[PDB]
Amino acid sequence: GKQQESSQYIHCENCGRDVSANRLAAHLQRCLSRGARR
Numbered sequence: 001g002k003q004q005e006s007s008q009y010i011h012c013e014n015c016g017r018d019v020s021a022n023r024l025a026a027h028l029q030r031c032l033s034r035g036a037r038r
């Protein structure tokens with residue numbers, strides 16, 4: 001292994017999705033933006 005980034009998919013609590021923990025914050029920006037629940 002070398003090019004294998006440990007992106008690590010974890011369970012987002014915001015949409016309930018398997019998303020990279022390494023990208024969870026940027027994801028959350030998109031996630032929270034989209035997840036405007038009313």
Ligand SMILES: [Zn+2]
Binds near residue numbers: 017019027028
């Ligand atoms: Zn999410």
